[PDB]
């Protein structure tokens, strides 16, 4: 087993409006090796086969999948916007790519600024996002944005945005 730099937690949020968000939010399991990650990924439903309104997230061990968390409070997210027609082609490969960027610590020195990632499966269009700790850190947010977009292999004409959680609750940067 090949150890990861960090221990990660995979969360699932169920769309069931006959239950509270607490009851619909589930911590599936945690892992700190490549082998344990792959074992987990291959025993859970692909993002593309989730029922509408359902979410996955991966956060560093100790960070709650909530913007009100101390590590997310003053942070934000790089948002990837996928249309209906992209789900079969892009959603799973982009979500897998995102998870590998997290566990692989692919953002060099600014990897510590990474809190986690979220995928939203919605009828109107899906979303992936990488969550960072501080939206004030311009070098960190900009470096993460550039590396992430390159790793997804998105062209220039697809402009991705970074929004602070403060603004979302109520684009600071683009690449």
């Amino acid at each position: 087993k090949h150890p990861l730099q960090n221990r990660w937690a995979l969360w699932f949020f169920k769309n069931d409006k006959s239950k509270t968000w607490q009851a619909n939010l589930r911590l599936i399991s945690k892992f700190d090796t490549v082998e344990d990650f792959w074992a987990l990924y291959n025993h859970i439903q692909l993002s593309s086969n989730l029922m509408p309104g359902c979410d996955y997230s991966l956060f560093k061990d100790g960070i709650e999948p909530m913007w009100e968390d101390e590590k997310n409070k003053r942070g934000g997210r790089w948002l990837i916007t996928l249309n209906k027609q992209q789900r079969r082609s892009d959603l799973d490969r982009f979500w897998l790519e995102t998870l590998l960027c997290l566990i692989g610590e692919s953002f060099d020195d600014y990897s510590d600024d990474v809190c986690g990632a979220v995928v939203n499966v919605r009828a109107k269009g899906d979303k992936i996002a990488i969550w960072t700790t501080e939206c004030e850190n311009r070098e960190a947010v900009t470096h993460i944005g550039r590396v992430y977009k390159e790793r997804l292999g998105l062209p220039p004409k697809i402009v991705i945005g970074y929004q602070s959680h403060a603004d979302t609750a109520t684009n600071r940067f683009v690449v």
Partner: peptide, 11 residues
């Protein structure tokens, strides 16, 4: 705006 991370709008 009910989604993972922003549960205040899920009430």
């Amino acid at each position: 705006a009910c989604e993972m991370g922003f549960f205040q709008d899920c009430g």
